[PDB]
Design a protein around this ligand. Sequence first.
Ligand SMILES: NC(=O)C1=CN([C@@H]2O[C@H](COP(=O)(O)OP(=O)(O)OC[C@H]3O[C@@H](n4cnc5c(N)ncnc54)[C@H](OP(=O)(O)O)[C@@H]3O)[C@@H](O)[C@H]2O)C=CC1
Ligand SMILES: NC(=O)C1=CN([C@@H]2O[C@H](COP(=O)(O)OP(=O)(O)OC[C@H]3O[C@@H](n4cnc5c(N)ncnc54)[C@H](OP(=O)(O)O)[C@@H]3O)[C@@H](O)[C@H]2O)C=CC1
Lengths: 88, 1216, 88
Amino acid sequence: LEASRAFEVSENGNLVVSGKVYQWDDPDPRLFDHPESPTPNPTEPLFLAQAEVYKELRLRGYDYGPHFQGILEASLEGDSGRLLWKDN
Amino acid sequence: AAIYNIDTSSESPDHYLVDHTLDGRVLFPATGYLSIVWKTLARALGLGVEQLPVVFEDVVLHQATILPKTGTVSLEVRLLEASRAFEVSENGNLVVSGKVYQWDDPDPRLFDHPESPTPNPTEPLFLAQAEVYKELRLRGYDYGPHFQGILEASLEGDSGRLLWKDNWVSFMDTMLQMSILGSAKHGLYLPTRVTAIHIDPATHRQKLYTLQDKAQVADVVVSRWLRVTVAGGVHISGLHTESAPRRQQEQQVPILEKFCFTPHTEEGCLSERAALQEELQLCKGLVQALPSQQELPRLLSAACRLQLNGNLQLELAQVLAQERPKLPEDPLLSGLLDSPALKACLDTAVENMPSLKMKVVEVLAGHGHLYSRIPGLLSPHPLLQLSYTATDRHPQALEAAQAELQQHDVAQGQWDPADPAPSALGSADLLVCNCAVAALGDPASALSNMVAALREGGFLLLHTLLRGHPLGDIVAFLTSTEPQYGQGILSQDAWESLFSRVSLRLVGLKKSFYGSTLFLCRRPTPQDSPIFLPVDDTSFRWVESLKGILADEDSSRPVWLKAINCATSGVVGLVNCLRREPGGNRLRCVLLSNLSSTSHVPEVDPGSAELQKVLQGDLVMNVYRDGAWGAFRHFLLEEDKPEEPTAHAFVSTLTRGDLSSIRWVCSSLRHAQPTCPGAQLCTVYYASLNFRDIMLATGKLSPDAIPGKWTSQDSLLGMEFSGRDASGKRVMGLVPAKGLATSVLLSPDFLWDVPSNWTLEEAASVPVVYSTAYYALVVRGRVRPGETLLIHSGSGGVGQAAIAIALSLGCRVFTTVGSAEKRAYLQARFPQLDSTSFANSRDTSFEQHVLWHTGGKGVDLVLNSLAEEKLQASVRCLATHGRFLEIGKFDLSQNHPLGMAIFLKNVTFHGVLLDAFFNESSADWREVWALVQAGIRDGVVRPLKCTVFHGAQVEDAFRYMAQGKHIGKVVVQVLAEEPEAVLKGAKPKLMSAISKTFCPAHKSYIIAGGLGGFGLELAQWLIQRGVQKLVLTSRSGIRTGYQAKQVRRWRRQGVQVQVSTSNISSLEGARGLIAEAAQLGPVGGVFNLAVVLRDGLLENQTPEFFQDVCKPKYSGTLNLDRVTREACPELDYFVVFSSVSCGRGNAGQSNYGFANSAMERICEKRRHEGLPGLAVQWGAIGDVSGTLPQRMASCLEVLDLFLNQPHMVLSSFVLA
Amino acid sequence: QHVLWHTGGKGVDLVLNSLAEEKLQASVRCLATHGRFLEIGKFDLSQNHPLGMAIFLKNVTFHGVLLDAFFNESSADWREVWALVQAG
Ligand SMILES: NC(=O)C1=CN([C@@H]2O[C@H](COP(=O)(O)OP(=O)(O)OC[C@H]3O[C@@H](n4cnc5c(N)ncnc54)[C@H](OP(=O)(O)O)[C@@H]3O)[C@@H](O)[C@H]2O)C=CC1
Ligand SMILES: NC(=O)C1=CN([C@@H]2O[C@H](COP(=O)(O)OP(=O)(O)OC[C@H]3O[C@@H](n4cnc5c(N)ncnc54)[C@H](OP(=O)(O)O)[C@@H]3O)[C@@H](O)[C@H]2O)C=CC1
């Protein structure tokens, strides 16, 4: 609905997703500056490798395959990390 | 995406939309969107519209499409069946949105008519179709025949009968009309939201039932308690209407004039204008012993500079700006041309013309320049078609300014005054010379040639200076090089001799105080035996004689109507009306209407000299009044709005939405009639502007939004004020509206006594802001010590008040400001605030700041005044057990959605509106008053920063407020504070404000023939101006649904409306009527609107018709005047309504004109005695002779002006 | 309709709503000026169903009541309810 800047995804006439979508007229890159975490975590000598994060997720019930295994590493408290980009 | 094209061509089936006209402009019906959406849904489902019982829901209209007179508009409809939502967009712009889906199982029980609150009185009266749509048109709806679907409606408007024409759009629009009919809110209202609409074509066809006539109708019921409208198979629930701007452009501009007697010959016309006298003084000073920008002073200075004396002819002949034809620009030469004397002469010229078409030719127009004046003065005459031609000496002269002649219906010409006129011009009726500036060849030759080229009975107008006068001598000394100019100046006796030599006779002579004159002469028509017919006889038996005499069409003898016994005879209107009927050219009038008892009455015997003089003049209208022969002439009315000194005035916007129209107006408080226990009058010193006032003045908020009962023509500016009560004690108060005025009527509950350590300026800023802050925080918010608050726009008054209240409790405060200036000001104002207590108010950045600095737990209490996306950000800052205070009003008005998932955090959402206290919950409000008093006592309440503007510059204050750069409070000073604490002389000083008509509540008013259409509209207007005791007279009493509806509604408002039905024709009836009015209270004013029409040519009318026509208008007015002159000492208004026919003339309404003229004469007589009196002449009344009907709104607006004018007779009409 | 009729088309000062979906909207429409809405149900709140803010134009308060917020630990506010019930 261009006039209402609203979208609606359907499956066999059944609503699946809804909301509002529109073009961003004036993108300000400053919106993507990383907020400062409350905890400085100075030393940071340990972190979750790629294997461990997905082991925890599997234990929690998430069975992501190789393509969705994008988290390269993360901090112990999940406040940061390093995601992988594959043009997807 | 179905696309629909809406056409208005007669061929297209959509042509019927032309009849849905609102405020003079065609708009797409709100139900047309529903119809097209229903068609789209039926197409999508594959069913027909007649087999798809549909349900709408949450319909919202965002804008109104305007159907152009030419072309087409395309509308796109899109459906989301999964979401059961639709959308109507025009040219990519959203128009309508909502939910539409099929009705799975229609329930016919839904359409059963709701229980009627009324006990079914079975009243015999009901609002018929004509009356219903008359009311709607008076309100502002102009539905045409197609959208006129209502046949009947109950007086309450809760039930009625609707037509059916196989047109859903019209039927549903008719239901909406029925919904609006019963509303007591005046103005134009349009749908904005509808909660739900159910349509079931099967039940619809079941419900329809045919009357005895083949027309199909369906009963309708409106229930405001349940807020549902039901009719046939349709069921509308939760309809919401918003007040329209109710503004139209290119509105009617009636021609307002005064109808006053004007002697034929008058002298010293320009004795008033000081500029002319000063210019004459300067000229004579220059020309002593043989300094400005005016032409003549500059020429005199140049003559002096070139040579002190004996200036050579050549040197002064060729001087820059001298040979230019700018010379007539001097005020003295144009002194009379601008004066009404020219208008009087022109009006006399057009009158006496055998036909309404006049032939006028100007001589020496190149230099006279009368072509720029004459066409503009005869425009007011509606039916006058004028043939004008400008003639000059040489084509090169006047060769410039050809576009000016092009715009006017004028043509060039070549005719030297001595040379005989060309055959093309031939005989002419009016001939104008302007000899003062233009140099005619020779007097004798020029006048002889004019008269030769002048039609029989035509008029000659000659504007010339007079020799032997100072200005004449001055002009004689100068321009001696132009002998043609020298020959054109003579003494008055010389002009008389020249006129005598030719057949022309002098009929009019307007003379200035400094010599300049304006001659008017006509060529006598070949004389013939006249007929003198007295018309002063009662019973109008002379009407039979007049009928007989005019019968002989072959005869062309003049007929003179003579009336001398009665000074109130309306022979003038009779003649004006008869001159249009066949054979009326022969008519001529002589009237003896001396306005003073001691005035001498000249003899009108055939042997009398005066009769012979008037016969020589041969003028149709010949009125004698106090030793001066003349006639009544219309003159344009001055445009300035009258002003008077007063001690009770208020500020208002004369034109809605314009800040340049702000001006002081007289206030109804002058009478102090609503004074009583529980209320008192307080003189106002300082008044505080608020955001609401700016919104109102700018036109972005309708007055109807302001809660409460308010008159349509009223001001709602100002809520705060500071001044002295009736006891002289300094005090500050809070008022729902009208607080921006010299005086305010207020209840003692809403008053605080300012502490001794304050100043009335400071106290003017406390009431509103601190009241709302205390209410929202303490009462609604239940703030507690030590909590966390978020106060938006802390710089604003409410923000400062809330911050002051919060810091008193030690609560941690976060606030948002729109600049560094405001941030620094707040930091200086409240030392407690620290660096981390400020955020940006112009974007959502404050959300992150609050969450970060609060540990991500949000705040405990939010006082929001922002809108839309910034409102949503504010909600997200709430903590568990939070409290949201919403003082803003944008999203609430727009009904924007609010996600209910916030309440899972156990928060409460408050909608705070302080204005609710002034209407109800008065007992509760005293809690807030106690809170404010305690805050003042404890020092918590601090007056805000003030920016004082004087009363004379309210507009400047409003403009400054409009800009968002103001910080603190903006107060407009109205009266400088005295250095005393308590002062008995608290009365406000006088102010010059626009005068307005208001009436006291302890007087009764009479409207003879008041049950008529204009009668009832005037009565409605008076009630809005403070009339509590009203009497209406009707010969047959109440006999229509509309009359009963209006009368019942007025009584329901506490007014004492009493129908008398006592004819004013008989003096006994008038006495009884007046005595009846005295029962309610002393008589304040009487209005005579009675009328009975028996039209037809004079050949058809009979004396009985004149008797009937003049019985209510003439005789009734006489009886009213005689009685009120005897037993009405407090009478303020003695108004009688007349018609343009008496003054312009209409064929077949001779009796009507006679009656109106008699009314005008009696009204004029009353004023000369000092008593009240006014006669208004109306062109044509629309809502209830070459003119157009005048809208009732404009009619009443004009009437408001006349009542405050010092003239006896006034007129208003709209040209075609 | 029943409430709006027997209340003279005014409404009800207080509403204790435990219904859901459509019936919640109708209960909202029964409010009067200065009315107070007490929502003790949770289905509509959990689904984040929209609420028209036009109702607040009438002086009105909307309360999200959750008794479960106290059972975690005793609080000075809970003792108020305990005393109220004991007095009852
Ligand atoms: N509940 C009720 O019935 C009552 C409500 N009110 C209403 O609350 C509102 C706030 O009152 P008050 O603060 O005294 O009003 P003001 O007009 O003084 O508001 C000033 C603030 O509004 C914002 N603002 C002002 N002008 C502009 C502009 N041109 N563009 C953008 N923002 C602007 C700024 O906030 P910022 O600095 O953050 O940019 C500014 O500091 C008013 O509409 C008032 O009538 C008040 C009393 C009673
Ligand atoms: N276009 C217009 O409407 C214009 C109106 N006017 C004047 O304005 C006034 C109002 O006209 P309007 O209301 O539109 O027309 P109406 O036809 O409604 O006016 C007549 C009304 O006055 C009553 N009436 C008539 N004669 C008498 C009487 N002798 N004593 C008491 N009541 C009487 C009639 O009741 P009943 O029939 O029982 O006597 C009726 O209610 C009239 O004087 C009219 O001449 C002039 C210019 C334009």
